[PDB]
Amino acid sequence: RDVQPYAGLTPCKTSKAFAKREKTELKALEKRLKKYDPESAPALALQATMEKTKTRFANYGESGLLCGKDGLPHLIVDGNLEHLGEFAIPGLGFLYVAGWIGYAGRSYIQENKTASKPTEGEIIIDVPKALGLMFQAGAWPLLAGLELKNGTLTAPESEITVSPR
Amino acid sequence: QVGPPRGTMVKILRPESYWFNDYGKVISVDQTGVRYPVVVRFEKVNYAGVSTNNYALDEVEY
Amino acid sequence: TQPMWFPGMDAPQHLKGELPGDYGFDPLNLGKEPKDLEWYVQAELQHGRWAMLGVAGAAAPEILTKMGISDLPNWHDAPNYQGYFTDATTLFWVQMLMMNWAEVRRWQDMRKPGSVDPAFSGNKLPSGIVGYPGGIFDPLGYAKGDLNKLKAKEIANGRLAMVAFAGIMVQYDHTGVGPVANLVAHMSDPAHNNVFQAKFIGF
Amino acid sequence: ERPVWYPGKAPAPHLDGSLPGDFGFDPLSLSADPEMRKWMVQAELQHARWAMLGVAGAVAPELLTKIGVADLPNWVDAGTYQYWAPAGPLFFIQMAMFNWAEVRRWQDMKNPGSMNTDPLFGYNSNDTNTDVGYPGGLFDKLGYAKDPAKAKELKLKEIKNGRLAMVAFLGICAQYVQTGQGPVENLFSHIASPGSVGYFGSQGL
Amino acid sequence: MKNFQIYLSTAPVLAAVWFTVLAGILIELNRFFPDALSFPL
Ligand code: CLA
Ligand code: CLA
Ligand code: CLA
Ligand SMILES: CC(/C=C/C=C(C)/C=C/[C@@]12O[C@]1(C)C[C@@H](O)CC2(C)C)=C\C=C\C=C(C)\C=C\C=C(C)\C=C\[C@@]12O[C@]1(C)C[C@@H](O)CC2(C)C
């Protein structure tokens, strides 16, 4: 895709410095290659590395990246629609995954707190129940919203131990 | 007999207590008019590793 | 005792069975209290109705184009389509203005059916169970026959259409052609137009 | 007292001879828990039956090729044979079918009485059956389990032939790895001259 | 046997297995979808 220049950053696809970066790396690869005869396995490995570099640079060109004066891609994280894949979408993926991990943990700690000996189950994890809670934590945002609305997400002030101050 | 019966959960009100604002089972209450008659047992240990100590009648709530 | 999604085991306790569509299906226990359960019954109603409309409106331009009787665009580039009465954003703001009223009234009903027409003060709504208002909302209005059967029919058709709409959304996200075009391609070569040739050309 | 997997060694204490093909063979004590033991008896029975079917369908095409009824490839070469559908969709439908059937099997293991009535036609396999892994009414289309005296030794025969076919399939895999032909070829090659061709005979150390 | 399974269910062994599997999946994703600076669109 063709992205508009933003914050004084030209698109990497049409950036001469991006082409120079690609060129330089590829030439370095060639130099590394030259000492190896083509039949030997390092020669093929280096040619595959060159291919990988070319397709990486091409993919970065097409992915609507903005490059700077240095010639390397720069991320726009202000929320711009043209660069949402830089931070927003992977940000949403992280927020979903991290909240899943945390909610699986919270659910297991609350469930194990009802056991006869909670601290032993804290180190010897009940794998079937654990996995059940882990897969139930797929709908973490919903269940967290329910806990927030019902007031059971947060313990009241009086129950929590505090310093004498 | 004065104070909480045995077996009930009492909320600690002593500010300096490790289990302040926490709940503990009453083991026994001394009726000989001692200053801290209420023996409260705690699931969780303090920094000294003990799970119980003594409280007055006004340092507990049930 | 109701017909159950998993015949061998027993239905969950919080799923009574009288609900129009209760087949005991709740592995990840989101049901819990009845209060958010009602919030879900209504959510499922709305998702089923909106996705039935969604599938029908994403197929109908495709059916009409492929038959060749109305050269309409594909549903995915329908928003991209140009020629609407006004700018995408202009009609969007008008659209959300029109929907704010209707949906907040439904929310008021969700909160309290009794609470919720001043435009025609004579025109009211007959009192009905939440999520099934009737009256003016069903001009056909032949509910004298079976009711719970028909409600269960609506719910299961809605559930199917939502699965279908998610499926096609993924299908365009992985093929980039209309859902009926995907369908007819699978008819043409069933063993070589299936999911294995999906590539995620574009989100 | 009973015959065991190793004469002079006491059978495993968790094994009491109350299972088909029970010879006290469990040096790793992998079935000390009765709940685990139930699951594992089911695993043996399922693997046994699958290995027997595996041997039958890996031997029969090559035998028919040798006889001359029809021309078919080896068990390995059948993977790359071009069918009506590629390996993708074929396996897809196969796995859908096995999710259906194996969920029914799984819940039979959990609940023996469950999964004894047809979910689509109401046919009753066995009214209130408990023997898990042996759904006679469901699959006994010849009535070869109507007598417990007959049924127990038939169970023993099944387990023995099953274990034999598990070992046979492992041998089939190792033979194709080490030689490159189908099992039945390897068999006839060994038959022709057991002093020249065979493992340690072809100098394939 | 069962006790050994319980031993496996201990915090260190389970952490090692879980992070071994996780590293495996992440490595496989970086092999089949390599060099991903941003989510494409
Ligand atoms: C390669 C990518 C990468 C990696 C390796 C990490 C790694 C980490 N991040 Mg970061 N992060 C990333 C990308 C990444 N992040 C991106 C792209 C974003 C933008 C969304 C963030 C935003 C982010 C935040 C906001 C936080 C982290 C935190 C952490 C740590 C714990 C995360 C976790 O899941 O713990 C397991 C998860 C839990 C125990 C549950 C705790 C709550 C989680 C973190 C969020 C759920 C709350 C909810 C959505 C509301 C968010 C409010 C927020 C917007 C302020 C860990 C060091 C946390 C940290 O260390 O701060 C002290 C933290 O608070 N990350
Ligand atoms: C049950 C999991 C869990 C949850 C939900 C939280 C939640 C929280 N922690 Mg805690 N924390 C945890 C575990 C958890 N923590 C563990 C294991 C440690 C020891 C490393 C800590 C150490 C810790 C510190 C030092 C601090 C927090 C802080 C915070 C808060 C900020 C967001 C955050 O997590 O960033 C912090 C995230 C991390 C430090 C990463 C560790 C989380 C790991 C990945 C979870 C491991 C458990 C996992 C889910 C498996 C168990 C379940 C399984 C058997 C099913 C939030 C209330 C901060 C705070 O007070 O904010 C107000 C803070 O300063 N946490
Ligand atoms: C059901 C039992 C069974 C039967 C009847 C046969 C029959 C035959 N096999 Mg097969 N085989 C079997 C099991 C069986 N095998 C098993 C379990 C294996 C895996 C070890 C093999 C591996 C195998 C290979 C690789 C070869 C044969 C060959 C032969 C042929 C006889 C020639 C020869 O020297 O055999 C010798 C074969 C055996 C004695 C088989 C039994 C294996 C025992 C248990 C030896 C110990 C192996 C052990 C795993 C070594 C590793 C130790 C390590 C862990 C430290 C004949 C057709 C040869 C052939 O086809 O030539 C034409 C040939 O090359 N077999
Ligand atoms: C299920 C099975 C094989 C199934 C094969 C099938 C379906 C084959 C199908 C095909 O060929 C056809 C039909 C046709 C081809 O066109 C296609 C394919 C697909 C190729 C094998 C199991 C094979 C299973 C094997 C070999 C298991 C061996 C286990 C052993 C020895 C265990 C020993 C112990 O556990 C005890 C008993 C006691 C403990 O205390 C001690 C120890 C030692 C741990």
UniProtKB/Swiss-Prot annotation, chain E:
Localization: Plastid, Chloroplast thylakoid membrane
Transmembrane region(s): 7-27
Topological category with respect to the lipid bilayer: Single-pass membrane protein
Any GO BP: photosynthesis
Entries under InterPro entries matching the protein: PSI_PsaJ, PSI_PsaJ_sf
GO CC terms: chloroplast thylakoid membrane; photosystem I
Keywords: Chloroplast, Membrane, Photosynthesis, Photosystem I, Plastid, Thylakoid, Transmembrane, Transmembrane helix
Gene3D superfamilies tied to this protein: Single helix bin
Role noted for this protein: May help in the organization of the PsaE and PsaF subunits.
Family: Belongs to the PsaJ family.
Protein name as annotated: Photosystem I reaction center subunit IX
